[PDB]
């Protein structure tokens, strides 16, 4: 079965404006790990917004099976304790909470905060770095335990060694989220060999879709992208 099904779908940010995503068609099997790559401006971030129903659908079919969590690049933080930023309404449950803390590599952060996870962060609180903010934001999503995770370059501000650990512990084939549907928008080539399927976008359309090895041998859009544009 498919957790996400999109058919001939077109989206715009405003009815007055030309559509940003044109004739999108793809299906994502439940449990798949998917990367969506392409040049800046290719529509890959908007694709997540479209699935969250944050654009205007002009035509097409979108079917989403399950709850959805979103982890945006621009991690945001509410003016509250670090703990409350993760718990986000939900009740504290152990050992799930500390499992999430550890996997999102927050332990070294907690160890230098004035009150561990009780520390007030945000305006009014302690100044967290962008990387610290992304770890907290990812922890919040992981703790919600959704069926579908939409990631938009969620570790772009995180140290590369730590990001590796986070990908392995949370996002990848052996992470806490290994049974979830995961859609990873990224401009990095680093973890592409590990995903199940890659969707290559250009001009708000899908150029090609396949595994890393398939697309790499095809020597078309993905190959170009890896060669010339990928970080």
Curated annotation (Swiss-Prot):
Q: Where is the ABC transporter domain?
A: 4-228
Location in the cell: Cell membrane; Basolateral cell membrane
What result is annotated for mutating residue 153 to L?
No effect on protein maturation and leukotriene C4 transport
Which ranges sit in the Cytoplasmic compartment? 1-231
Q: Name the positions where ATP 1 binds.
A: 13, 38-45, 73
Tissue expression per record: Lung, testis and peripheral blood mononuclear cells.
| Annotated effect of mutating residue 152 to L | Impairs protein maturation and leukotriene C4 transport
Q: What does this protein do?
A: Mediates export of organic anions and drugs from the cytoplasm. Mediates ATP-dependent transport of glutathione and glutathione conjugates, leukotriene C4, estradiol-17-beta-o-glucuronide, methotrexate, antiviral drugs and other xenobiotics. Confers resistance to anticancer drugs by decreasing accumulation of drug in cells, and by mediating ATP- and GSH-dependent drug export. Hydrolyzes ATP with low efficiency. Catalyzes the export of sphingosine 1-phosphate from mast cells independently of their degranulation.
Q: How does it assemble?
A: (Microbial infection) Interacts with human cytomegalovirus protein UL138; this interaction mediates MRP1 degradation via the lysosome.
**Would you identify the family this protein belongs to, as annotated?**
Belongs to the ABC transporter superfamily. ABCC family. Conjugate transporter (TC 3.A.1.208) subfamily.
**What disease does the Swiss-Prot or TrEMBL record associate with this chain?**
Deafness, autosomal dominant, 77: A form of non-syndromic deafness characterized by adult onset of bilateral, postlingual, mild-to-severe sensorineural hearing loss. Sensorineural hearing loss results from damage to the neural receptors of the inner ear, the nerve pathways to the brain, or the area of the brain that receives sound information.
Protein name, UniProt field:
Multidrug resistance-associated protein 1
Identify the species of origin: Homo sapiens (Human)
Range of the intact protein held here:
641 to 871 of 1531
């Amino acid at each position: 079965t498919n957790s996400i099904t999109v058919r001939n779908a077109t989206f715009t940010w405003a009815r007055s404006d030309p559509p940003t995503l044109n004739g999108i068609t793809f299906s994502i099997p439940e449990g798949a790990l998917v990367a969506v790559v392409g040049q800046v401006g290719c529509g890959k971030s908007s694709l997540l917004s479209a699935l969250l129903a944050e654009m205007d659908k002009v035509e097409g079919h979108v079917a989403i099976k399950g709850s959805v969590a979103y982890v945006p690049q621009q991690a945001w933080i509410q003016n509250d304790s670090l703990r409350e930023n993760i718990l986000f309404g939900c009740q504290l449950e152990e050992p799930y909470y500390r499992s999430v803390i550890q996997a999102c590599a927050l332990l070294p952060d907690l160890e230098i905060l004035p009150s561990g996870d009780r520390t007030e962060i945000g305006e009014k609180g302690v100044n967290l770095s962008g990387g610290q903010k992304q770890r907290v934001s990812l922890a919040r999503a992981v703790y919600s335990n959704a069926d579908i995770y939409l990631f938009d370059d969620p570790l772009s501000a995180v140290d590369a060694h730590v990001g590796k650990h986070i990908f392995e512990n949370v996002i990848g084939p052996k992470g806490m989220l290994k049974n979830k549907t995961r859609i990873l928008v990224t401009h990095s080539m680093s973890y592409l060999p590990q995903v199940d399927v890659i969707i290559v976008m250009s001009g708000g359309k899908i150029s090609e879709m396949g595994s890393y090895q398939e697309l790499l041998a095809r020597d078309g859009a993905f190959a170009e992208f890896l060669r010339t544009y990928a970080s």
